[PDB]
Chain A
């Protein structure tokens, strides 16, 4: 059934599972034509498929050419997502295939279900959680590889860098979603917080800076404060 606050620790057990977020698959800019009508221009997008226990991210880059000559693109984007997720599962050895796939938006259930008919024992689940994975394109290195791509491409990352050497996956995921919540609510302030100190660098093979334990604590508190301020602002509380 659905994933919610109640059954949240299931994410960190040893049943393989993936989150799939399709929010950044079909991305456009809206502009005015010479005659003054509105038109869209597609830009490169990505599927965000993440194993929350291990940090493994399967970033499938969606090249604008996919859309060429197609109608009803926002509907097509859901089926392309499901096609690509299904291909990913097929590509994995049996003992690495997930037992559950949790889609972050309910509109993906039927497309994925249909694309996964060959895997009747992989459960396709919605979630009631309000996960911030749309802010993935606020991570500079992910946005850079998506925008530079000249063709369809799968790029693999560990979204937790090396954190798991020192913290559990429960704590890792809570840090990730806090960082992403912050980036979603106020990207400029969130990015300022992460980079202010030039002596804390991002390793070539990492996505986030190499904070010490104590510095992560200062960071997490600053992201919390960011998120609460913006809430009072939105609702005048």
Chain B
């Protein structure tokens, strides 16, 4: 079990850790989150009580260093930092626990939710999408735009998701215009899986990371990316069978976890209706289809 201490909490803020969240009052004696499960990526995120816009937060993996949060009163936000002095860090973490100023990562033992949402997400791939190589952790917020969004302004602050575009030369072989547009198997399996992602796990990891960014920060370009990667699979006639079964599980836990009140902006009616009911893989997402029909029948 790992810990992320907080120097202080000077401003009223709602703090999230993965799918859990806590209200912290201005200058309340909050000094971190303990018992964080080792072995998965994690995200700590923030929404100030005074600005319900700009949710922001940090992806990290405790195996990669000792990390803590400190409020910056110049930039006005809670910043993540790395402590390189292992001794000095254990000392802070032990004294705060002794004083019991830390909340416990509130995992129920039955619950594989976070594992299921992050199964293929690796810190190393996150840091290629959020490029800032002087830090071991990655900042994301509501307003960051994606590379594909930027093509259609500041590249330092971009989400470098893999560009998917169904009406592009990359997606369409000369002479197979109609075939490749109606059956994207070539684009998925040769261009994206074999060519760019190398394997399905890296593909699923980017898909899961895009979803989480859309859910936790309302990042709109991430939602576009999540839907594109779903649509590419569902619009391919020839998909490895192990990928379809894993996709049904991936999507199930994402739909399960989504806040009920957000289904209007977070779920693209056209993509979902096409994937579940029109596409080649209409009959291959049985768990995802059952939870969509029982929870969001309006969208369909």
Contacts and interface: CB of A to CB of B under 8 A. Distances in A.
A117 B169 contact: yes
Interface in B165-182: 167-169, 172, 177-178, 181
A111 interface: yes
A187 interface: no
A82 to B, nearest CB: 8
A113 interface: yes
A211 interface: no
A113 B178 contact: no
Contacts of A111: 177-178, 181
A117 B181 CA distance: 12
A114 B167 CA distance: 6
A117 B172 CA distance: 9
A118 B178 CA distance: 15
A115 B177 contact: yes
Q: Is the interface of B mostly helix, strand, loop or mixed?
A: loop
A117 B169 CA distance: 7
Given A114-B167, A117-B168, A83 B181 contact: no
A121 to B, nearest CB: 14
B168 A110 contact: no
B181 A110 contact: yes
A79 interface: yes
Contacts of B167: 110, 113-114, 117
Interface of chain A, helix or strand or loop or mixed?
helix
Q: Which of A79, A83, A117 has the most CB of B within 10 A?
A: A117
Contacts of A114: 167, 172, 177-178, 181
A186 B270 CA distance: 41
A139 interface: no
A60 B177 CA distance: 20
A122 interface: no
Contacts, number: 22
A13 B172 CA distance: 34
A132 to B, nearest CB: 28
Contacts of A66: none
Interface residues of A, number: 11
A115 B177 CA distance: 6
Nearest to B169: A117
Interface in A90-117: 110-111, 113-115, 117
A76 interface: yes
B42 to A, nearest CB: 42
Nearest to A86: B177
Contacts of A83: 177
For B168, B169, B177, B181, the residue with the greatest tally of chain A CB atoms inside 10 Å of its CB is B177
A116 to B, nearest CB: 10
Contacts of A76: 178
Nearest to A117: B169
Interface in A109-165: 110-111, 113-115, 117-118
Contacts of A79: 177-178
Contacts of B178: 76, 79, 111, 114
A111 B169 CA distance: 14
- Give the residue among A79, A82, A114, A115 with the most B Cβ atoms within 10 A: A114
A117 B177 CA distance: 10
Contacts of A115: 177
A118 B177 CA distance: 12
Contacts of B181: 110-111, 114
A79 B168 CA distance: 16
A28 to B, nearest CB: 20
Nearest to A72: B182
Contacts of B169: 117-118
B181 to A, nearest CB: 5
Interface string B172-211: 1000011001000000000000000000000000000000
A136 B181 CA distance: 31
Contacts of A113: 167
Contacts of B177: 79, 82-83, 111, 114-115
A151 B177 CA distance: 24
Contacts of A82: 177
**9 A-B pairs with least C-beta separation:** A79-B178, A114-B177, A114-B181, A117-B169, A115-B177, A113-B167, A114-B172, A114-B167, A117-B172
22 contacts: A76-B178, A79-B177, A79-B178, A82-B177, A83-B177, A110-B167, A110-B181, A111-B177, A111-B178, A111-B181, A113-B167, A114-B167, A114-B172, A114-B177, A114-B178, A114-B181, A115-B177, A117-B167, A117-B168, A117-B169, A117-B172, A118-B169
Interface of B: 167-169, 172, 177-178, 181
Interface of A: 76, 79, 82-83, 110-111, 113-115, 117-118
